[PDB]
């Protein structure tokens, strides 16, 4: 476990169980000043008392901890407590953090409706242009402040994705007797608002469109909704992105077929009209890029797709945390119940994740979220709990483990997925020792010049010894080990120049 070390700092860095002793030159009995690094008992029984040994133990201090409050009416809900803690951990020692999450009722929600408009959604659009009032009323049952917006996408307006024939660009529809609009990549139609009349009017002004190949450019629309916060109108509440389609999607490598070599740059490109007009200059975003942008924006995607497209979006939602997949009808007639089910299944689940661990630091979770005594197993990368009820508070036990040292106070940012609430951990490593026994040029230790620089007295260069009294007598003589047993019988371990025992027996006689 613990082995003899030169100084207190190296001794504590060697093993968490080491119990370096700092008594004032009590080794003046034939013992080298490098064997004061062992367990607690071997240093408490051997000379120094409780005052003259310093075993450093890291601790955690809570900086700000406001109580879990459910706002006033979904207004100021605090759900994650504490919010800023300072954790100082000695290398090799566990540190347990108690993180509580409360599922406040009436938490506000923003729902951006991102629709497909590829002429197979004509009846879907006909239903959606009236479903706004129903959606708002139904969502007002679980929350009090709900805001809904609308967007749409078709595809990039180049071959082979859409037919760029000039007559087929103005009217991408099979017949000219029906009304429809020219293809686009992403049109932000309505910003998140609280009235359903604006939703009805704006969506009813929209028309269907069309393209050439089956996969759609919905990833571009998803990325632009995640990135353009000021234009969409996101706030700091739970954000839902309802993605409705009846076909697959284009990914990052698909734009090469249209002569598009430039990768998607991850910048907001909506013009004053809400159009993503420079979409033919960038390629489609990738699954990883879209997932990263959605995670960074705390948006939970809801994929409302038909039965023929379900498995692809099941895979995609397996690749994206905090996402839901429902089965959309052929005319989007079940979209409100789908949205409600997805929102309930997303709110019932609480996940706690860490931003990034510094090198040598390990994290583990213990999801105690039913009963104040029952907690599940450790060694996970997520504090996951499902079926969390309203007004119920869950608990997570976060364990931190540092191996060597941390030079800088790197900040850890534990957070609950789908929420802007954050838990900042100031991660300092207690791998420097301050026993206060050190005195600069102390007369008690060494002789003349030189400082201890540690609990053990550093020998002056002028002469060798505990106080430079004997250059070689203390250092060289090995009779001090030979004194080590009689009557120990093996129940007691040997001691330098003695025999140590336990269990009502003590001393060399034992």
């Amino acid at each position: 476990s613990c082995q003899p070390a030169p100084s207190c700092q190296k001794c504590i860095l060697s093993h968490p169980s080491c119990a370096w002793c700092k008594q004032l030159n009590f080794t003046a009995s034939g013992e080298a000043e490098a064997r004061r690094c062992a367990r607690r008992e071997e240093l408490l029984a051997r000379g120094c008392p409780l005052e003259e040994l310093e075993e450093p133990r890291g601790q955690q201090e809570v900086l700000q901890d406001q109580p879990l409050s459910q706002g006033a009416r979904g207004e100021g809900a605090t759900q994650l407590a504490p919010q800023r803690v300072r954790v100082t951990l000695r290398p090799g020692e566990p540190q347990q953090l108690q993180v509580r999450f409360l599922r406040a009722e009436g938490y506000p929600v923003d729902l951006y409706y991102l629709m497909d408009l590829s002429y197979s959604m004509k009846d879907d659009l006909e239903r959606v242009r009236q479903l706004g009032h129903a959606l708002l009323v139904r969502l007002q049952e679980v929350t009090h402040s709900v805001r809904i917006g609308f967007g749409s996408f078709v595809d990039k307006t180049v071959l082979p994705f859409v037919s760029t024939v000039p007559s087929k660009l103005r009217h991408p529809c099979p017949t000219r007797l029906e009304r429809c609009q020219s293809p686009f990549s992403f049109h932000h139609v309505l910003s998140l608002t609280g009235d359903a009349q604006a939703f009805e009017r704006e969506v009813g002004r929209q028309s269907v469109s069309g393209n050439l190949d089956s996969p759609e450019g919905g990833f571009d629309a998803i990325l632009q909704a995640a990135l353009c916060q000021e234009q969409i109108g996101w706030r700091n509440v739970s954000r839902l992105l309802v993605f409705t389609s009846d076909d697959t999607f284009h990914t990052a490598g698909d734009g090469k077929l249209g002569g598009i070599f430039m990768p998607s740059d991850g910048h907001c490109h909506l013009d004053s009209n809400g159009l993503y007009s420079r979409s033919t200059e960038f390629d489609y975003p990738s699954v990883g890029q879209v997932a990263q942008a959605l995670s960074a924006a705390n948006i939970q995607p809801i994929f409302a797709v038909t039965s023929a497209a379900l498995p692809v979006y099941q895979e995609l939602s397996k690749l994206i945390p905090k996402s839901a997949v429902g089965e959309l009808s052929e005319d989007s007639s079940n979209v409100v119940q789908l949205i409600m089910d997805a929102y309930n299944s997303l709110s019932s689940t609480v996940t706690l994740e860490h931003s990034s661990l510094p090198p040598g630091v390990h994290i583990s979770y213990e999801s105690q979220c039913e009963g104040p005594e029952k907690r599940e197993g450790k060694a996970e990368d997520r504090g996951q709990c499902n079926h969390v009820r309203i007004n119920q508070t869950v608990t997570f036990w976060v364990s931190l483990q540092a191996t060597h040292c941390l030079p800088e106070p790197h900040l850890l940012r534990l957070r609950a997925l789908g929420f802007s609430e954050e838990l900042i951990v100031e991660l300092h490593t207690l791998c420097d020792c301050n026993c206060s026994d050190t005195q600069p040029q102390a007369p008690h230790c060494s002789d003349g010049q030189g400082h201890l620089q540690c609990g053990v007295c550093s020998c002056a260069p002028g002469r060798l010894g505990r106080l430079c009294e004997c250059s070689v007598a203390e250092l060289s003589s090995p009779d001090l080990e030979s004194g080590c047993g009689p009557l120990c019988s093996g129940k007691g371990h040997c001691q330098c120049g003695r025999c140590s025992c336990s269990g009502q027996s003590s001393g060399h006689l034992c």
Binding site: S167, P263, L319
Partner: protein, 909 residues
């Protein structure tokens, strides 16, 4: 490593040859190396391909003539080269004049190895050149449109009820025309007597609004001025002021009932106009006055009637729907059917390419058959090819293979005496897959052999077959999934080992980029760089164009990873990682393309090029040297208490066979570091001068040998209390220090896979019969007090071991006592005569190893005697085998081993 990042060559950033891809091409007749780059067409540079050379320490690019010229928008350029020539393909859009569809395939040109034209090939109307019986070897925008103008009479002779019938007929005719015609609009004016302009063909885009506008007309009625109506139609309806197309087919529809009267203009004057050099005119003259009077001749003059096709005389408005079909027959356009199956129109043949030999190329077709994919095997001289694809056996798996993008990447696997074409399908089942053409009989189809595991990772978009030892048979296949997701788009390369017996694939390794980059796109570009490291083994470069993206102040981003090929495969880790920040400022997507294996700097060593999005970077390769060191100790044996000068004759020699390093160690400096007595806590030897064994920057310049003369001295009197009977090991640690600046010729680099140290030992003459080693026998005669017993009758089990040394000399000998942990020692007894040290360790749970520190060089021919009294540590064990083994280990040059065993048997279960 080899790549000289400190001296790169860059194309100008002004984007004159805006670089999309870059490769090195050599003519294997004159050994001329070029830097062919591909660019998107602009107003400044129309050419798709340029050839660039290293002239006066600058890259000068010139367009390559006789290549297809892109028109309009950039749609895609691919360039591949082999020793057979250079193949360039551009995606070309062709619009069918009488159809609402478009063809998007490639126009390719095959150049010879000297960049001279060999063959041209366009794959529009592919079915003409598709002969499927040719066995596969396998080593065995102006708009024409149509504009129609309607002239509806509204004179006072027409009662209001008839106006409704005429309006309904006009609306029905427009509706049927829109049903049968698409790229064709409508406009009309009210021929009532006051020349008023109704909705024009600009408003005809919204068909429903035009119908309501037509339904909203009202008849006023002044007088029948036909010529004025025609002139107004010419001046407003057919003029391009409101968007009328100049070449649009212009059709005039005139339905009149009253003849010309009170018209200042003449009917014959308006028809004989220069602008009427071909315009369609129709005259549906409902009315009995036409039949009964001269104004029938007026009707004939209104519209030309060579075959009476335009003349439509009807008696009443009730038959308007009767002759509507006849009116539609000769005016409607019968545009080409839209919705036909997509077989080869958007096949995009030449999306990826591969030169198989002088006459044959392998061209990928991503979009064939609803983007199912495929590959065209095209013979350039016979101008005949065959199409290869998955060949689904039904209609369910034909639709299941759609949008798989087969032929996105195409490659060739070389084997013992056969070839094997492979193709990537980066969205097959949404993971990606690699297909291989497996022939049987005369039908060859691509079947999947490898698949991805992550959705959207684009497995199979990049294919890199690697032949490590250059024997003509590929050993490895590198498959990239550049958008593989862990936290962002990291990228992943899969290394597959090709079996030499049948050609199967085994996942040898999974490669990744440097940790800490969530966006890297590792594997987006990979290439076999030939031999960069000068070991005759192929090495691989993998680019990560997105490493460092989003940096402040527009810093350069992107990385390239160099993997040296070994006899067992690729390296575990990259030898080099070339970041764009250390190459040049303002490099975006460094690592988008790469190519190597040919000497472009003139030094004789093959070097590489890395293409960024907009620029091409050229790096020269450094010579690789390996040194061989040798000591020449003069005494050759340190005598007892030498206290004399030890002479050292270090002599570095260039063991590398990379010819003569051209201006190599001519400028670089060697750096010695002599570590005398490495390993010992108290060194018994040290250099006479302490400044010649810490760091010594000597200049080599000319010559392949560098020799030195050092001196070794004893330390502070050199007391022999330490282990004098052990060889003193001295470690030479050389290093290479290159100068600072732009050297004209590349500076050498020490081989990374040769350890740069040369541990040597000089032996102390051990006092013995042979004064170079003291070997002694360690004989033991341990006696067992009692062999075994059980049930407390054991009491204190006793053992006795006596070690006897009677050979020459025993040096740092070792003990080993192996007894099971079921028994434990209450007390331990040391050997009294003499006081031989014995560092007995603690008991261990496993097989006991009491490596007691007996012996030491001081040990004479005396003997030891150790007493041991065992007792069971609250453990009972049954009868076993091998009993207890005791081993004596001597750390001399020659090892003498002693073995002893006891007897154990108790008869109590």
């Amino acid at each position: 490593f080899n790549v000289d990042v400190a001296r790169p060559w860059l194309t100008p950033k002004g984007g004159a040859p805006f670089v999309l891809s870059s490769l090195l091409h050599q003519d294997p007749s004159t050994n001329q190396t070029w830097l062919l780059v591909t660019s998107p067409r602009t107003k400044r540079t129309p050419g798709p391909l340029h050839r660039c050379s290293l002239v006066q320490d600058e890259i000068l690019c010139h367009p390559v003539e006789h290549v297809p010229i892109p028109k309009g928008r950039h749609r895609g350029v691919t360039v591949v080269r082999s020793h057979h020539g250079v193949l360039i393909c551009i995606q070309v859009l062709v619009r069918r004049p009488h159809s609402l569809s478009s063809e998007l395939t490639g126009t390719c040109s095959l150049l010879g190895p000297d960049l001279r034209p060999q063959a041209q090939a366009n794959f529009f109307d592919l079915e003409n050149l598709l002969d499927p019986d040719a066995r596969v070897d396998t080593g065995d925008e102006e708009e024409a449109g149509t504009e129609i103008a309607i002239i509806l009479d509204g004179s006072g002779s027409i009662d209001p009820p008839d106006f409704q019938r005429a309006k309904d007929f006009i609306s029905n005719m427009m509706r049927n025309f829109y049903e049968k015609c698409f790229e064709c609009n409508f406009a009309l004016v009210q021929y009532g007597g006051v020349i008023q302009t109704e909705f024009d063909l600009r408003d005809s885009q919204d068909v429903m609004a035009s119908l309501a506008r037509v339904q909203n007309i009202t008849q006023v009625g002044s007088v029948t001025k036909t010529a004025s109506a025609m002139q107004h139609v010419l001046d407003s309806i057919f003029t391009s002021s409101h968007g009328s197309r100049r070449k649009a087919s212009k059709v005039m529809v005139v339905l009149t009932d009253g003849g010309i009267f009170e018209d200042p203009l003449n009917l014959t004057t308006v028809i004989n106009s220069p602008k009427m050099q071909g315009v369609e005119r129709f005259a549906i003259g409902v009315g009995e006055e036409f039949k009964s009077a001269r104004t029938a001749r007026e009707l004939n003059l209104i519209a030309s009637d060579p075959d009476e096709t335009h003349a439509f005389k009807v008696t009443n408005y009730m038959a308007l729907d009767g002759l509507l079909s006849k009116l539609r027959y000769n005016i409607i356009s019968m545009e080409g059917t839209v919705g036909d199956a997509l077989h080869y129109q958007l096949a995009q043949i030449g999306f990826s390419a591969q030169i198989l030999d002088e006459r044959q190329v392998l061209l990928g077709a991503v979009g064939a058959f609803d983007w199912s994919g495929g590959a065209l095997l095209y013979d350039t001289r016979s101008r005949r090819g065959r199409f290869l694809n998955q060949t689904a056996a039904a209609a369910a798996d034909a639709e299941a293979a759609q949008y798989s993008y087969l032929g996105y990447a195409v490659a060739v696997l070389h084997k013992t005496c056969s070839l094997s074409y492979i193709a990537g399908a980066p969205r097959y089942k949404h993971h990606g897959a690699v297909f291989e053409l497996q022939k049987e009989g005369r039908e060859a189809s691509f079947l999947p052999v490898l698949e991805g595991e992550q959705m959207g990772s684009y497995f199979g978009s990049e294919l890199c077959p690697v032949d490590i030892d250059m024997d003509g048979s590929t050993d490895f296949l590198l498959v990239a999934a550049p958008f593989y997701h862990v936290h962002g788009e990291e990228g992943r390369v899969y290394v597959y080992r090709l079996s030499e017996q049948d050609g199967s694939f085994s996942l040898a390794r999974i490669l990744s980029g440097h940790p800490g980059f969530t966006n890297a796109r590792f594997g987006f570009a990979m290439a076999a760089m030939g031999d960069l490291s000068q070991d005759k083994l192929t090495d691989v470069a993998i680019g990560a164009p997105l490493e460092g993206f989003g940096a402040d102040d527009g810093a350069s981003f992107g990385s390239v990873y160099i993997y040296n090929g070994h006899w067992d495969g690729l390296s575990a880790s990259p030898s080099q990682r070339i970041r764009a920040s250390t190459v040049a400022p303002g490099l975006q997507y460094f690592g988008m393309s790469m190519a190597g294996g040919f000497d472009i700097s003139g030094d004789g060593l093959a070097d590489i090029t890395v293409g960024t999005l907009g620029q091409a970077v050229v790096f020269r390769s450094r010579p690789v040297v390996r040194l061989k060191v040798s000591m020449a100790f003069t005494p050759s044996a340190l005598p007892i208490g030498f206290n004399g000068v030890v002479n050292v004759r270090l002599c570095f020699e260039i063991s590398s066979v990379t010819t003569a390093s051209e201006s190599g160690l001519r400028e670089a400096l060697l750096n010695f570091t002599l570590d005398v007595d490495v390993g010992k806590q108290r060194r018994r030897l040290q250099c006479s001068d302490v400044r010649s064994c810490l760091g010594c920057l000597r200049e080599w310049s000319s010559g392949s040998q560098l020799c030195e003369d050092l001196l070794l001295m004893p330390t502070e009197g050199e007391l022999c209390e330490e282990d004098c009977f052990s060889n003193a090991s001295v470690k030479v640690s050389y290093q290479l220090q290159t100068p600072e600046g732009q050297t004209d010729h590349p500076q050498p680099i020490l081989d990374r896979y040769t350890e740069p140290f040369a541990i040597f030992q000089l032996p102390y003459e051990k006092a013995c019969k042979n004064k170079l080693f003291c070997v002694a026998e360690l004989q033991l005669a341990t006696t067992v007090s009692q062999q075994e017993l059980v049930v407390g009758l054991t009491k204190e089990l006793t053992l006795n071991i006596n070690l006897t040394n009677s050979g020459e000399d025993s040096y740092m000998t070792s003990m080993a006592l192996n007894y099971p942990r079921n028994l434990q020692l209450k007390r331990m007894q040391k050997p009294p005569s003499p006081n031989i040290q014995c560092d007995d360790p603690q008991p261990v749970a496993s097989v006991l190893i009491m490596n007691c520190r007996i012996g030491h060089p001081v040990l004479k021919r005396s003997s030891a005697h150790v007493s041991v009294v065992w007792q069971l540590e609250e453990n009972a064990f049954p009868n076993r085998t091998a009993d207890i083994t005791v081993t004596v280990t001597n750390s001399n040059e020659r090892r003498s081993l002693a073995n002893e065993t006891h007897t154990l048997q108790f008869r109590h279960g």
